[PDB]
Design an enzyme around this catalytic site. Structure first.
Site, PDB file in Angstrom:
ATOM      1  CG  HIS A 296      -1.770  -1.132   1.426  1.00  0.00           C
ATOM      2  ND1 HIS A 296      -2.791  -1.486   0.574  1.00  0.00           N
ATOM      3  CD2 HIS A 296      -1.748  -2.069   2.400  1.00  0.00           C
ATOM      4  CE1 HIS A 296      -3.359  -2.595   1.014  1.00  0.00           C
ATOM      5  NE2 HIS A 296      -2.744  -2.970   2.121  1.00  0.00           N
TER       6      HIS A 296
ATOM      7  CG  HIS B  35       3.079   6.019   5.434  1.00  0.00           C
ATOM      8  ND1 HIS B  35       2.799   6.123   6.773  1.00  0.00           N
ATOM      9  CD2 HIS B  35       2.023   6.571   4.792  1.00  0.00           C
ATOM     10  CE1 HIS B  35       1.605   6.698   6.920  1.00  0.00           C
ATOM     11  NE2 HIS B  35       1.115   6.996   5.729  1.00  0.00           N
TER      12      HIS B  35
ATOM     13  CG  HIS C 182      -0.444   8.560   1.166  1.00  0.00           C
ATOM     14  ND1 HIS C 182      -1.206   7.429   1.259  1.00  0.00           N
ATOM     15  CD2 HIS C 182      -0.123   8.891   2.438  1.00  0.00           C
ATOM     16  CE1 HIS C 182      -1.343   7.094   2.541  1.00  0.00           C
ATOM     17  NE2 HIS C 182      -0.696   7.962   3.287  1.00  0.00           N
TER      18      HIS C 182
ATOM     19  CD  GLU D 229      -3.729   9.690   1.981  1.00  0.00           C
ATOM     20  OE1 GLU D 229      -3.410   9.773   3.183  1.00  0.00           O
ATOM     21  OE2 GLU D 229      -4.269   8.702   1.468  1.00  0.00           O
TER      22      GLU D 229
ATOM     23  CG  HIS E  37       0.749  10.797   6.101  1.00  0.00           C
ATOM     24  ND1 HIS E  37      -0.268  10.065   5.524  1.00  0.00           N
ATOM     25  CD2 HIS E  37       0.514  12.107   5.841  1.00  0.00           C
ATOM     26  CE1 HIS E  37      -1.088  10.926   4.951  1.00  0.00           C
ATOM     27  NE2 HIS E  37      -0.643  12.162   5.122  1.00  0.00           N
TER      28      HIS E  37
ATOM     29  CB  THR F  71      -5.700   8.531   5.015  1.00  0.00           C
ATOM     30  OG1 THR F  71      -4.405   7.981   4.814  1.00  0.00           O
ATOM     31  CG2 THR F  71      -5.636   9.899   5.656  1.00  0.00           C
TER      32      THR F  71
HETATM   33  N1  LIG Z   1      -2.047   7.257   6.289  1.00  0.00           N
HETATM   34  S1  LIG Z   1      -2.116   7.481   7.848  1.00  0.00           S
HETATM   35  O1  LIG Z   1      -0.916   8.112   8.298  1.00  0.00           O
HETATM   36  O2  LIG Z   1      -3.364   8.094   8.239  1.00  0.00           O
HETATM   37  C1  LIG Z   1      -2.292   5.905   8.594  1.00  0.00           C
HETATM   38  C2  LIG Z   1      -1.397   5.456   9.634  1.00  0.00           C
HETATM   39  C3  LIG Z   1      -1.776   4.023   9.972  1.00  0.00           C
HETATM   40  C4  LIG Z   1      -0.979   3.605  11.161  1.00  0.00           C
HETATM   41  C5  LIG Z   1      -1.337   2.248  11.710  1.00  0.00           C
HETATM   42  B1  LIG Z   1      -2.550   2.149  12.800  1.00  0.00           B
HETATM   43  B2  LIG Z   1      -3.103   0.466  12.731  1.00  0.00           B
HETATM   44  B3  LIG Z   1      -1.670  -0.541  13.126  1.00  0.00           B
HETATM   45  B4  LIG Z   1      -1.945   0.973  13.987  1.00  0.00           B
HETATM   46  B5  LIG Z   1      -0.306   0.507  13.496  1.00  0.00           B
HETATM   47  B6  LIG Z   1      -0.389  -0.296  11.878  1.00  0.00           B
HETATM   48  B7  LIG Z   1      -2.131  -0.325  11.405  1.00  0.00           B
HETATM   49  B8  LIG Z   1      -2.694   1.339  11.216  1.00  0.00           B
HETATM   50  B9  LIG Z   1      -1.016   0.827  10.712  1.00  0.00           B
HETATM   51  C6  LIG Z   1       0.014   1.313  12.054  1.00  0.00           C
HETATM   52  B10 LIG Z   1      -0.816   2.195  13.328  1.00  0.00           B
HETATM   53 ZN   LIG Z   2      -0.554   8.067   5.319  1.00  0.00          ZN
END
Ligand SMILES: [N]S(=O)(=O)[C][C][C][C]C1234B567B89%10B%11%12%13B85%14B%1158B%12%11%15B%139%12B%1061B%12%112C5%153B%14874
Ligand SMILES: [Zn+2]
Length: 257
Positions: free
Chosen positions: A61, A91, A93, A103, A116, A195
């Site tokens: 992704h 990361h 986008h 975004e 981000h 996101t």
């Molecule tokens: N594009 S963004 O920056 O909004 C998403 C960030 C997602 C970060 C996560 B959350 B859950 B798990 B927790 B750990 B793993 B999964 B999602 B990714 C990481 B943390």
């Molecule tokens: Zn992001």
């Protein structure tokens, strides 16, 4: 599984993640004339000098650089935040061409990419607990435009060939994320969400006004990445951005006049 294609992209995500139609989804368009300057907002405190990068990963992704978040080494504080937020990963986008990829948008303008830096609140103890809380995460968003090269990005660029396809990771130690930051820490802030699935409504967004410039060669290397796993039909990892979502009952605040 979810993705960015016609049959699995953002318009489909609500079926597995109904919060996709929630009250505080991200990203949003930042209407600069409507955002209110808030003199009560504090300067952002970005303390990255002790950051410890670990790995760089292609997860199908985006690609991410992961950090040691087992102590307060790279932390975000101040700004709109109460307490201390540890850096977990960053990361990006990006688009198939330079006129899309971000975004967030600014007066409907799309940037070529968006960085981000994902942080979680140490009072919830771990990121999985933090994602269940309305003030669990703080994501620092930085726009990328195409022009001059960003020297601090080159070390990232040059290892992407080693993580071309989903699954793949590499050692990525001693990377200093201070080299990705613009001069100014002026920002917009609002309450929002991840996101990407699970789209949890746990994020205080902090979006910097000043973009960084990256070169065409740098972003072209992002576009050489693949969504697919090794040997599967090749699908360029491009256009891995969620479009702007309804603002609804939210205020975007500016740290600057
Ligand atoms: N594009 S963004 O920056 O909004 C998403 C960030 C997602 C970060 C996560 B959350 B859950 B798990 B927790 B750990 B793993 B999964 B999602 B990714 C990481 B943390
Ligand atoms: Zn992001």
């Amino acid at each position: 599984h979810w993705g960015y294609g016609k049959h699995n992209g953002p318009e489909h995500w609500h079926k597995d993640f109904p919060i996709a139609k929630g009250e505080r989804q991200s990203p949003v368009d930042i209407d600069t004339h409507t955002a209110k300057y808030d003199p009560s907002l504090k300067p952002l405190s970005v303390s990255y000098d002790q950051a410890t990068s670990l790995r760089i990963l292609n997860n199908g992704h985006s690609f991410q650089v992961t950090f040691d978040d087992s102590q307060d080494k790279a932390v975000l504080k101040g700004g709109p935040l109460d307490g201390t937020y540890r850096l977990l990963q960053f990361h990006f986008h990006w688009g198939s061409l330079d006129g899309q990829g971000s975004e967030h948008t600014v007066d409907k303008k799309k940037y070529a990419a968006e960085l981000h830096l994902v942080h979680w609140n140490t009072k919830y103890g771990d990121v999985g607990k933090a994602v269940q809380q309305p003030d669990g995460l703080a994501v620092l968003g930085i726009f990328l435009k195409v022009g001059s090269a960003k020297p601090g990005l080159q070390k990232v660029v040059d290892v992407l060939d080693s993580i071309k396809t989903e699954g793949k990771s590499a050692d990525f130690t001693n990377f200093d994320p201070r080299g990705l930051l613009p001069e100014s820490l002026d920002y917009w802030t609002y309450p929002g969400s991840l996101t990407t699935p699970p789209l949890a409504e746990c994020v205080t967004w902090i979006v910097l006004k000043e973009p960084i410039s990256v070169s065409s060669e740098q972003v072209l290397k992002f576009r050489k990445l693949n969504f697919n796993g090794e040997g599967e039909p090749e699908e360029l990892m491009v256009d891995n951005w969620r479009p702007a979502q309804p603002l609804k009952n939210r205020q975007i605040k500016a740290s600057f006049k």
